[PDB]
């Protein structure tokens, strides 16, 4: 059957993406109604040195912006900050505005990047939020403003707008409210990511995926308890397991129990000794339980 | 920077997928104009035993088809039988029909899967075609007639319809003209894939990606000439790198020559010494030169 990191379709989101430029700064904006949200660092004259955003807003001239979509130019009428984002009121309303809410993504939850280079939708991949509020995506010069979204029970949420990349390769963005995940600064300064807490829920779903695909070697007769585990987790940089009921269907279809895999995590966290689960030489927390159920049984 | 397997956006394609059933079989059709393409085995009374296709098609009533989108039912008037594909003429034309062409994918080449469960919305993800005309995607019961596509020069090409899974779990499909890739049969019989042959272009592309992400341990003070490598490849299940001029820019940007990388393949094909390259445990041929240049530079 196979296991692949998937994106939910880009259809509702593609038509919302605009080229936003100012001086030498070209990046991406989100166009809902008459509003256009994009990273504020697009104003700054020099983004390689510390920036004064009070100064930069004070000498902002609305005629200098070049907000565009396709062969439509959107004139700017108002520019305020909201957190690290810059909310522009533009002269047009997006005929293709979808029913949407804004939500903040939490450590362990999966979402979709529409990676856009300087105003063009480019590619869709699925990501997973790490404990320190970073993602391990693919982002370059020109992809700031690239938009993250989830679809839950018919509802479209926008959840992420791309800002920076940390010394260690990690990628940092903001919720559409304008708070940087992880509390990181919209500055070029050195910022350390700090130690990474693996999602116990997501590893369990991954191993359940392994089983459904035939890989069984990692499972013994040993079962660790929810209480035993959560204690072990607290000193081995691993989350406390939400609940056993999350995996009910998965436990049924395999005849293997969360407590059976919770022990697998412990034995494998010490090594694979050269073995691979679905071609990984190491445990993977990329996949939520929801993704595995969807991808293994179409639910 | 980072490297991910990506997909071109799906928003032209999403609205073309319908649900097609006949008897106990349910799968996906492509609705363009008044035409629904779909795999012919939708008509097989039992899809786990070898199928007499001329008998099963000889007793087929077109009224026994079900073809729906958003529980709006379309009515079948005619069909033509075209290779392993069925082409149903329906009473209604698809209002959301994108300007499209058709092409056939060659080994080495990348394309996008929209994976739909039983006409349902689905998930998007990039694949790459292996030497035997298979892919290693993610497919389950209910996902047949799921569609592959490339966007080249702003032109949408439909290129893949999904049919079956080999024992090894490789995935087989057809172009939209009903010719099945790698010549496989539309049957549950145990068909063997054949020897995988790795794309040399794609492995070089990949090592350039690693070079650009600061992973350098594989490069050495040794170059292998093109003819020299081509000899080695013929007897090691690798394609013949035809040119070097594809990699001109990656050569320039990185300072490393194709030949340095050609020699790295020969060494690394022996095995990684328990090291990794962008968290892979052996050479990767899933990324074309084009994909890497796009992803590292925005071109
Ligand atoms: C924090 C801001 C003041 C600017 C931010 N700085 C930044 O992310 O620092 C890394 C860097 C530095 C120079 C060149 C390339 C990358 C940034 O460049 N964001 C980029 C996206 C970065 C560039 C590389 N990968 C990314 O995610 C789009 O604006
Ligand atoms: C199409 O509905 C289905 C897609 C298969 C289901 C499992 N993964 C896929 O890609 N096609 C079939 O089931 C196909 C039927 C025709 C060839 C007549 N047979 C085949 O795909 O192998 C059956 C199989 C089912 C479950 C696991 C492994 C193989």
Task: Report, as residue numbers or ranges, the catalytic residues of A.
Answer: 41, 142, 144
Give the atom of ligand 1 at the shortest distance from the alpha carbon of A186: 1
Token pair listed for A142: 């020109």
Give me the residues paired with residue B82 across strands.
B85
Distance from CA of B78 to the nearest CA of A (A): 31
Token pair listed for A282: 């190491």
Backbone torsions φ then ψ of A39, nearest 5 degrees: -60, 140
Q: Is A1 on the interface with B (CB under 8 A)?
A: yes
Closest to A177 in 3D by CA, of A106, A83, A107: A83
Give CA separation, A35 vs A18, A74, A113, A118, B132, in Å: 11, 10, 21, 18, 50
Q: Please, are residues A37 and A30 in contact by the beta-carbon 8 Å criterion?
A: yes
Token pair listed for A49: 């040195």
* A window 269-288, beta carbon within 8 A of B: 274, 276, 279, 281-282
Tokens 């166009």, located at residue: A31
For residue A184 and ligand 1, the question of a CB distance below 6 A is answered with: no
Q: Please, are residues A29 and A38 in contact by the beta-carbon 8 Å criterion?
A: yes
Task: Give the number of whichever ligand sits closest to the CA of residue B41.
Answer: 2
How far is A220 from A60, CA to CA, in rounded Å?
Answer: 64
Contact residues for B138 (Cβ-Cβ < 8 A; gap 6+) = A1, A2, A3, A4, A6, A295, B115, B125
* B window 191-210, beta carbon within 8 A of A: none
The structure's method of determination equals X-ray
- Give the H/E segment covering residue B289: helix B289-297
How far is A71 from A6, CA to CA, in rounded Å?
Answer: 31
Residue with the smallest CA separation from ligand 1 atom 13 is: A48
Token pair listed for B44: 């097989």
Closest to A205 in 3D by CA, of A281, A261, A271, A276: A261
Query: Packing angle between helix B258-270 and helix B200-212, nearest 10 degrees?
Result: 100
For residue A139 and ligand 1, the question of a CB distance below 6 A is answered with: yes
Q: Would the CB atoms of B125 and A4 count as touching at under 8 Å? A: yes
Distance from CA of A290 to the nearest CA of B (A): 13
Contact residues for A123 (Cβ-Cβ < 8 A; gap 6+) = A114, A115, B6, B7, B8, B9, B126, B295
Give the atom of ligand 1 at the shortest distance from the alpha carbon of A141: 23
Q: Would the CB atoms of B6 and A118 count as touching at under 8 Å? A: no
Give me the residues paired with residue A7 across strands.
B124
CATH code of residue A286: 1.10.1840.10
Distance from CA of A292 to the nearest CA of B (A): 11
How far is A133 from A146, CA to CA, in rounded Å?
Answer: 17
Let me know the angle formed at the C-alpha of B210 by B209 and B213, rounded to the nearest 5 degrees.
Answer: 90
Residue with the smallest CA separation from ligand 1 atom 17 is: A164
State the DSSP code for B16: G
* Host domain of residue B222: 200-297
HEC assignment per residue over A250-281: HHHHHCCCHHHHHHHHHHHHCCCCCCCECCEC
Q: Is B253 on the interface with A (CB under 8 A)?
A: no
For residue A171 and ligand 1, the question of a CB distance below 6 A is answered with: yes
Residue with the smallest CA separation from ligand 2 atom 21 is: B164
Q: Would the CB atoms of B139 and A6 count as touching at under 8 Å? A: no
Reported as half-sphere exposure (CB side, CA atoms, 13 A), residue B91 has a value of: 10
How far is B266 from B269, CA to CA, in rounded Å?
Answer: 5
CA of A160 to the centre of ligand 2 (A): 37
Q: Is B118 on the interface with A (CB under 8 A)?
A: yes
Give me the residues paired with residue A36 across strands.
A31, A88
Q: Would the CB atoms of A11 and B6 count as touching at under 8 Å? A: no
How far is A4 from A182, CA to CA, in rounded Å?
Answer: 27
Q: Please, are residues A35 and A89 in contact by the beta-carbon 8 Å criterion?
A: yes
């Amino acid at each position: 059957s196979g296991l692949r990191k998937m994106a939910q379709p880009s259809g509702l989101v593609e038509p919302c993406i605009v080229r936003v430029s100012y001086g030498n700064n070209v990046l991406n904006g989100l166009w809902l109604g008459d509003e256009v949200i994009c990273p504020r660092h697009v104003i700054a004259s020099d983004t390689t040195r510390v920036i004064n955003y009070e100064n930069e807003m004070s000498s902002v001239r609305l005629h200098n912006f070049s907000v565009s979509k396709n062969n439509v130019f959107l004139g700017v009428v108002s520019a305020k900050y909201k957190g690290v984002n810059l909310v522009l009121k533009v002269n047009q309303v997006n005929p293709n505005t979808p029913e949407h809410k804004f939500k903040s993504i939490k450590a362990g939850e999966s979402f979709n990047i529409l990676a856009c280079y300087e105003g063009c939708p480019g590619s869709v991949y699925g990501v997973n939020m790490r404990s320190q509020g970073t993602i391990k995506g693919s982002f370059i010069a020109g992809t700031c403003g690239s938009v993250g979204y989830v679809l839950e029970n018919g509802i479209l949420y926008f959840v992420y707008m791309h800002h920076l990349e940390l010394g260690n390769g990690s990628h940092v963005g903001s919720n559409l409210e304008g708070e940087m995940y992880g509390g990181y600064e919209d500055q070029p300064s050195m910022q350390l990511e700090g130690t990474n807490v693996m999602s116990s829920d997501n590893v369990v779903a991954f191993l359940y995926a392994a089983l459904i695909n035939g890989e069984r070697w990692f499972v013994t007769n040993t079962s660790m308890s929810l209480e035993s585990y959560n204690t072990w987790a607290k000193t081995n940089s691993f989350t406390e397991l939400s609940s056993i009921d999350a995996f009910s269907m998965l436990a049924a279809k395999t005849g293997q129990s969360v407590e059976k895999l919770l022990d697998s995590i412990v034995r494998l966290n010490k090594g694979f000794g050269g073995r691979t689960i679905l071609s990984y030489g190491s445990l993977c927390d990329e996949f939520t339980p929801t993704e595995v159920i969807r991808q293994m049984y179409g639910v």
